[PDB]
Symmetry: D2
Subunit: 488 residues, 4 copies
C-alpha cells in the first residue's frame, strides 16, 4: 500500500464512496430540493414510473458530471428501483456538495472537483466495479470514457487470455492513455475477466454528448461496438436545447465567475458554429460583445452571417480579440503559435471537449513561460517575449462546468428526461432482440413527450388540433407532428 | 384582360399586365443579379455546356424580379421556358414584362382573378401540339395538382364518358379546376396522359407542396419523380426563416404603415416561417405571442422569451395577427369579431384558408372598404368596428410587398437549378423512381459556399489531420446525414 | 406644374399634385387617427373651447398622412391653416390632396424642384393683404430662415436701395432664396417686417433647426419666441430614435429591396437618429459599423456590441451607408469612388450635404441611371462600377418610403400642439421673450401618459407615503430637471 | 471591554485595519493586477497626475463597496499622494481578498463580507477616525451613510455642547438608527468635537449613487448641507454606463451565482425602468426571459413598451412571475401581501437601495414563516399557509454585490475616473471659494474625457472633425460636442 493510495470509504450502511467532504451533504440536499422544482420532466418520471419500479434489480453505472442536476437524475433512477454507482466525466466538473448528498443518501459516488488524471481514471474504475454480484447492466455515459475503458479492457483481456501478457504503458506516448493502460494492467491482477463478464451482461449505453456519439458510430462502423447504444444527444429536446440554450446560459456564467471580465464592449471569437457555438455566440452578442465566428462548414458559416456575425479565420483576428471560445469537438483549434500573438490578458477557453481544442501541451513547454494561478481554474500564463499574459480557464477543459456550474437545472431536465427514457427502453427490451450492437435514437413521440412535460412549468399553453385540422396536415391529434427529417 | 395570348415579334406567347414596364423590369433584374451570386455562378459553370439545350421547362413560381433571374438562368443554360405565377397577387408586373419581352413565355400579372390564375397555369403548361413540359418547377403544387387531377379525370372519361362535376366540391376554387379539366376533356381527352408520359420530373419549393408530394408517393398516385427542394438546409433554414424575417415587416409597413414597436403581435405557428416572423416582430419592438400545436416548437418559443398561448386568450388584445401554419381554420370569423378596431390580420403561410375569408365575406351585414390594393378594412354590423385584412388573406409578403429579397432567393433558387439539372441529366438513366428525393448534402453545402464570398465570409480549411480526427473529408460533407443545423 | 395657386369652391388656395387622390388620403387619415391618440385626445380636451379661434398658422413640415392629422387637430381647435412641406420628396400626395380639399391651404407635392419648394414656402407664408401668420410650425427652419433673411434684406434695401445678389453665394439653393427675397423687395419691401411684427412665435421640430435657433438667440438676431419641440423627452427619445428604427429599414427595402441580413452597414453618427438606425440594421442581421466624433456616443456604440471605426477604414467593405449626423461632408466623392459595385448610400439626417451630391453630379464622365423615382445608380468612368443613391441624398425615410409611423408622430405632434397652444395662449402676456424655450416636464409627461392606454400599459400609482419618500408629487413631475432618461 | 468588542488590528507598519482574513492579500493582489488592465481611465490618471502628487497631505475617507474595483480606485488616490481610510457601504458587498490587499499594502480598511449592522456602523466610524492629526479632508461616499453620520454627529454635538446631553436610542423605533445614535453617544465620550472639527475641515464629498445624490439635494434644499458636494452619479459616463450596462452584467451574475436558475423561459418582473431597471430588463430579455416592467413614470413606461416589454402593476403579475427585481430607490415595492401570492421558489431581489424595497420586516414577522438558509445570501422563506417558499437574495440588500461581485472593472473605471476627477477638483479648489455648500456636477469636457480614456482599450477609432465641420455644427474640434441639456 502506497502512503497516498486512493481508498474507498463506506457509509454507515456500507455503501462505497470517495468524495471531497461528506460534511457538505446537507448543503447538497438543500440545492437538490431546489433543483427538483426546476426539473419537472424528471419529477414526472418519478410519479409515472416509481410505483412500478421498472429498474428493480438493475445496476447502473454512470459518468455524467457530478452536479446538482445529475443528482436529481441519479435519484430518479433510484426512485425507479435502480442500484447506482457514479463518477464524473471531467476532473473539474463535480460539485462537491452534490457528490456528498448522493454518497450519503442514494448511491456510490467517486468524484470531486479538482481530480488528477490518475484519480479520474481510478474513479471511473470504481464506478464500474460492482464486485462479486457483477454489473453494470446499464451505462449512462457522457463523452465515452467509461465506454472506452470497457472496450480497451476487453481487448487487454483477450491478449491476456491468449498469451498471458499485460498492457505496457511504455507502448504509448499519450500521457493519459499511459494511465489507462496502467489501470487495466493492475485490474487484470484482481479480476482478469471483469470486462468480458461486463460485455456479456451490459444491456446498453446511453450517450449524452456529440463527441461521445461520434465515437460510438466509429465503433459501429469498424465493428467493435460491444453492445446497444442510444444516442441521446440527437434527441431534438437535447441537441436543440441543452447544446444551444444551455451554453447561452453557462458560457457567460463561466467567464464571469472565472474572470469577472466585462463582456460588453469586447471582441469575442467563437470557433465553431454548431449548436454549442450558436449558443455561445448568442450569449456573447447578447451581452454586448462583438462576435466573430470561425468555421469549416459553409452552411454554418452562412448561418452566422445571417445573424450579423463576422466570419473569419482565427489568424485574421488573433491579435485583436479579447475572448476566445472553442466549440468544435475538433483538435488543434488554438495553437501555441496563435497564443503568442494574443494581447495581454486575452481570455482563452474551451467549452467543447477534452483538453486538445487548445494547445495546452505546446503552452506547457513554451520556453520561459510562467504559469501564475490566480485562483482555482483561472491561470495566467506569462510569455517572456512580451511580458504579457493570457488567461486560460479550467486548464483548457470544459470551462462552463469547470469555472461555474454548467447548465441550469431546467434545460438539464430536458436532457436527463431523455436519459431516463433511454435507460428505460434499453432495460425494458433486455430480452427482446430489438436492439443490436448499433447506435439508435429515440422516436419522435418520446422527444415530443419530453418537451410537453416542461411546458406547464413555464405556463405555455399549447393549442389542440381539431380532427379536421389534424387530417388536413396529416398528423394525428396527439402527434408526432413533424416529419422524420424535420430540423426544427 | 382579354384571355387571349399575345406574341412577341419572334412568335413567343405571353400575357402580362403591361409590356411597357419591361425597361424598368430589366433595370431591377440587373441589380438583382449582383445579389444572386449562386445563380450567376451557375450560369458561368454550366453556360458553356448548355445542359438544358432542348429542354422545355414549365414553372409556376411567383413572377418576381428574383424568379426572373432564375428563369434567365435556365435560359442561359439553354432551356426553353414557360411560366406562370403561383399566387394571384405575387407577380411583379415589371419582372413579368421583361421576361416576356426578352426570355420566356409568361402568363402572369398582379391582381389575377381565380379564373385568370388557372387559365395562366394552363397556358404555362401548353407547349402546343409538340408536347411538353419535360420539366416542372413548382411552388405550392397547383401545377402538379392539375396534372394529377387531369389524368384521373381522363381515366374515368375514357371509360364511362363521365365528366368532372363542379357540384362535387364546395370549394369555390376547386370548382374552377374541375371545370377547367372538363373543358379540356372536350378538346383533348389525353392531354394530361401525354403530358405525364413526357415529364422527367418536378422540383417543388415549398413546405405545403412537398407535403402533398410525399402523400402522393404514399398513396401511390405520384406520376413522376419529384425533388423536394424545401428541405435542402440552404432552403428551409434560410428562405423560410430569414426571408420572412425580412419580408413580413416589409409587407406590414407597406400595406398599413403601422408602428410595430409597442404593439402586441400574435404569430400562429413557430416552424421555420413562424420563427422568422416572430423574430422580425420582436426585433421591431413588438411583444410577440406565439400559438402552437407542437410542444417542441412551443418550448423553443418560450426559450426565446416569447409567450405561448391559445389564440382565444389574446384575440381582443393583439394588434397584429400573422398565420404561419400551413394548416386551415387558424383565424375564424368568431375570432375576428372579437378583435379590436383596426387589428391587422394576415397570412404568410398557404393559400387563403389559414384565415376564414369565406366566413368573413359571407357574414351578414359585413362591409368591405378597400383602403388601397391589398389593404381592406372590414366593418362588422354588431360592433361597428373593423379589422384590416391584408391581400385578401393570401401570402402577405408577396401580396403587399415584394416577398423575400434576392440574396436569400438565390439560395433557394440555386437549389432549384441543381434539382432541375439532376432530373434532366438523369432523364434516361432510371436513377429516379416515381418518388420524392432530396438533394445530397455536398450540393446543399455547395449552395452555401457559393454565397459566402459576396458577404466576405472566410471559411477555415481543415488540415488532413483535423479532418481525420472528426472523420470527415477535408472538402466535406461536414455533417452527419441527420444533422439539423 | 404651373406655379399658379388653385382654389377650392370656398375660395381656399392650394397647389397639389392631384386632387383626385383626396378620397384615398381620407381613408388613410381615418386609420392614422386611431394610431394617434395624443392628437385625438387634444381635440376632445380643447375642441369645445376653440383656443385657436381666430389664429392663422403656417406650417412647414413634411406633408404626410401624419401631418394631416396634426393639421386637422389645429383646425379642430379652430385655427385657419396654410402649409407646405419641408422637403422636396417627403409629401404624400394623397395626404396633401385630402387636406387641400377638406381642411387647409396646402402647397406641396412629391418631387418638387428646388424652385418649386421655395415657391411653396412663400405661398404657405402668404396670408395676403390681411397679414399673417400669427404662428409658425417649422421643421428644419427654412421658413424661419426665410423671414430672418428677408428682414435683413429689407433693412438694407430701405436705406441704400441695395438688393440681395445671388452671386454672393456659391450655394445653388441659397441663390434661389436670395433671388426670391430680391423679387419680394420689388413688390413689397416690408413684407417680412410686417410678418415678424405679427408672429407670436415658432415651434421647431428638429435637431438641426433647433440648433439654428439657439445660435440666433446667441447672436441676438432671433425675431420672435421659439419653442424647442425637439428636446421634449417625448420627441427626441422617441421620434428620433424609435421612428428611424422603423422608417430607415422601410426606406431601404422600398427603394432597393436589398437583403439587410448578412451585410455590412455603416452608420455615420450615433446620436438619437444613429442609435435608431444602428438598432434597425443590427436587428435585421446586418453587421453595423458606427462612425463618431463624440467619444461618449462612440463608447455607447461599443457597449452595444458595434464596431467604431473611421469611414476610411470601411469604405470598400460596407454594403450600405447611412448618414445621421446633421453635419456636412460626411460621405465625399473620394469615398464614393472606392465603394463596391451597388453599395447603397443614403442620408436620414439633414439637407443634402451629408453626402457629397455636388461632387458626385459634377464628376467628369459620371453617368446617372434612374432605376425608379428616388433610386438612382451612378456609374463612374474610372471603374465602370456604380453606387446607388437614395432620394438624391435627401432624407431617405420620407423620400423613399413614408417616414415615421403615426403612433410615434403622435408623440412629436402632441408636443407641437401643446407648444402652439402655449405661444398663442400667452400671445399678450409677455411671458415669452425673443428666446428659445422648452416645454415643462409635466407636459412632456402628459404626452407620454396620453399614449399608454392605446398600448395597454398600466402605470403604478405612488402612495402619498412613497411620493414623500422620493420627494415627488403623486401626480408628478417624477424626475429631476436634468434627468436624461 | 466586551469579550466580543470589535478591535482594530495594525500592520507591521502600524496602519489600522479590520478585515476577514489578511492571508487573502496575495489573492487580492493577483486580481487587482488583472483589474488594472481593465481600468485604463484610472491607470491613465496615475500616469498623468502621479508625478505631481496633487493629493499630498490630503486625507481621504471613503465608503464605496470594498471590491477589487474599489481597490484600484484606492490605489489611484494613494498613487496621487493621498492618505486613505476606507469602509464598505454595504454589509455584504466587500470582497475579502480586495480588503486584505489594500489593508496590507495601501490603506486602512474596515470591511468584510457578512457584517452585522452594528459592525457596519463601527466600520464607518473607524474609517472616519483619523485620530489626533484630524481628518478627513475629503469624502468619497456611495449611498450617503458616511455623510449622514457626520451630519447627525454635528447635531448631536450641538445638543451636547449646549445642554451636555447625549443621544438616546430609545428616542427612535428604527432599529438601524438606534445603532447610529448609540455609536454617536459612545463617540461623544472619546471626542465630543469630532464632527465639528470635521465640518470645519472637510473640503467636499463626491457622491456616487442616485439615492445618495437625492439625499444631498434634500440637505441643500433645507439648508443643512455642511460642505460642497460633487454629484458623480449624474456624469453621463456614470449614469448612462455604470447604472445601465453595469447592471446588465451584474444582475444576471447575481442570479446565477445565488440560484443557478435558468433565466430563459421564465417570467421576470422589473420594478422600475430608470437606468438600473433598463439595464436589468435588458439582461433578462437578452437571456430569454419574458420581462414585465412596473413604473410610476409614464415616459419611462412608454420607453419600456417601445422595447417590446409589457408594463403592468405588480398585482397583475405577482402570482405568475418567476423572478422579481427591484430597481426603484423607493420603498415598499414588494410587500408581504405580495409575497404571500408568489409561486413556490419565486426569486425575489433588490438591486436598488437599502433593504426596504422588499418588505423584509413584514416577512420576518409573518406568523409561522420559516427561514431556511440555502447558502450565504440565498435564503428560502417558507410560508406555512402553502408549504411553499420564496427565495430572497442578500436579505433584500443589493443582490449584485451581495451575491456576486457587482459591476465589472471596465465600467467601474468609468465611474471611478469620475470620482478621481471629482476629488481632484474639490481638493484643487480647497482655497478658491468656487464651491459652496451645494451640489455640483462635473463639466461636460471632463465627462467626454472619461469616455475618451476608455476607447483605445476597445479599439474604437474616433473621427476628427475638420475645422469646417466643427464650424458647421458650432462646436470646437476638441469638444465639448453636445449642448448642455443633451440626454445621450
Ligand atoms: N410566404 C412565404 O414567403 C413563405 C416562405 C416559406 C414557406 N411558406 C409557407 O409557410 C407555411 C409554413 O411553412 P414552414 O416551413 O414554417 O412549416 P413548418 O411545418 O416548419 O411550420 C408550421 C408550424 O405550424 C404549426 N401549426 C400547425 N397547425 C397549427 C395550429 N392550428 N395552430 C398553431 N400552429 C400550428 C406546426 O406545429 C408547425 O410548427 C407553409 O405553407 C409553407 O409553404 C411561405
Ligand atoms: N429623417 C428623420 O426622420 C429624422 C428624424 C429625427 C431627426 N432628424 C435629423 O437627423 C439629424 C441627427 O439628429 P440627432 O437628433 O441624432 O442629432 P444628435 O446631435 O443627437 O446626433 C448627431 C450625431 O452625429 C455625430 N456627428 C457629428 N459630426 C460627425 C461626423 N463628421 N462623423 C460622425 N459623426 C458625427 C455627433 O457627434 C452626434 O452624436 C439632424 O439633422 C436631425 O434634424 C431626422
Ligand atoms: Na448549473
Ligand atoms: Na423582393
Ligand atoms: Na409613415
Ligand atoms: Na465585479
Amino acid at each position: 500500500g502506497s502512503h497516498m493510495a486512493l481508498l474507498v470509504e463506506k457509509t454507515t450502511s456500507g455503501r462505497e464512496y470517495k468524495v471531497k467532504d461528506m460534511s457538505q451533504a446537507d448543503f447538497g440536499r438543500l440545492e437538490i430540493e431546489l433543483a427538483e422544482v426546476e426539473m419537472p420532466g424528471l419529477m414526472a418520471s418519478r410519479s409515472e414510473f416509481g410505483p412500478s419500479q421498472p429498474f428493480k434489480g438493475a445496476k447502473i453505472t454512470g459518468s455524467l458530471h457530478m452536479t446538482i442536476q445529475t443528482a436529481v437524475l441519479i435519484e430518479t433512477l433510484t426512485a425507479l428501483g435502480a442500484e447506482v454507482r457514479w463518477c464524473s466525466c471531467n476532473i473539474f466538473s463535480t460539485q462537491d456538495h452534490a457528490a456528498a448528498a448522493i454518497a450519503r443518501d442514494s448511491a456510490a459516488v467517486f468524484a470531486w472537483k479538482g481530480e488528477t488524471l490518475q484519480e479520474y481514471w481510478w474513479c471511473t474504475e470504481r464506478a464500474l466495479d460492482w464486485g462479486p454480484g457483477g454489473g453494470p447492466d446499464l451505462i449512462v455515459d457522457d463523452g465515452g470514457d467509461t465506454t472506452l475503458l470497457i472496450h480497451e479492457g476487453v481487448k487487454a483481456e483477450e491478449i491476456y487470455e491468449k498469451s498471458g501478457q499485460f498492457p505496457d504503458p511504455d507502448s504509448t506516448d499519450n500521457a493519459e492513455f499511459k494511465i489507462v493502460l496502467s489501470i487495466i494492467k493492475e485490474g487484470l491482477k484482481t479480476d482478469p475477466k471483469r470486462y468480458h463478464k461486463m460485455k456479456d451482461r451490459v444491456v446498453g449505453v446511453s450517450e449524452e454528448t456529440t463527441t461521445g456519439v461520434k465515437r460510438l458510430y466509429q465503433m459501429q462502423a469498424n465493428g467493435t461496438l460491444l453492445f446497444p447504444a442510444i444516442n441521446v444527444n440527437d434527441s431534438v429536446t437535447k441537441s436543440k436545447f441543452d447544446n444551444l440554450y444551455g451554453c447561452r446560459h453557462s458560457l457567460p456564467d463561466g467567464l464571469m465567475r472565472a474572470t469577472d471580465v466585462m463582456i460588453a464592449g469586447k471582441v469575442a471569437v467563437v470557433a465553431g458554429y454548431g449548436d454549442v457555438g450558436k449558443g455561445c455566440a448568442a450569449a456573447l452578442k447578447q451581452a454586448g460583445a462583438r462576435v466573430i465566428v470561425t468555421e469549416i462548414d459553409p452552411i454554418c458559416a452562412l448561418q452566422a452571417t445571417m445573424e450579423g456575425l463576422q466570419v473569419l479565420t482565427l489568424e485574421d483576428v488573433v491579435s485583436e480579440a479579447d475572448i476566445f471560445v472553442t466549440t468544435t469537438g475538433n483538435k488543434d483549434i488554438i495553437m501555441l503559435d496563435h497564443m503568442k500573438k494574443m494581447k495581454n490578458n486575452a481570455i482563452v477557453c474551451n467549452i467543447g471537449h477534452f483538453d486538445n481544442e487548445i494547445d495546452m501541451l505546446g503552452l506547457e513547454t513554451h520556453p520561459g513561460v510562467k504559469r501564475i494561478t490566480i485562483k482555482p481554474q483561472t491561470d495566467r500564463w506569462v510569455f517572456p517575449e512580451t511580458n504579457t499574459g493570457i488567461i486560460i480557464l479550467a486548464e483548457g477543459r470544459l470551462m462552463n462546468l469547470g469555472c461555474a456550474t454548467g447548465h441550469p437545472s431546467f434545460v438539464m431536465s430536458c436532457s436527463f428526461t431523455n436519459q431516463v427514457i433511454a435507460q428505460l427502453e434499453l432495460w425494458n427490451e433486455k430480452s427482446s432482440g430489438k436492439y443490436e450492437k448499433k447506435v439508435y435514437v429515440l422516436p419522435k413521440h418520446l422527444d415530443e413527450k419530453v418537451a410537453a412535460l416542461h411546458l406547464e412549468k413555464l405556463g405555455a399553453k399549447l393549442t389542440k388540433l381539431s380532427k379536421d385540422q389534424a387530417d388536413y396536415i396529416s398528423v394525428p391529434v396527439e402527434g408526432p407532428y413533424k416529419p422524420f427529417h424535420y430540423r426544427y
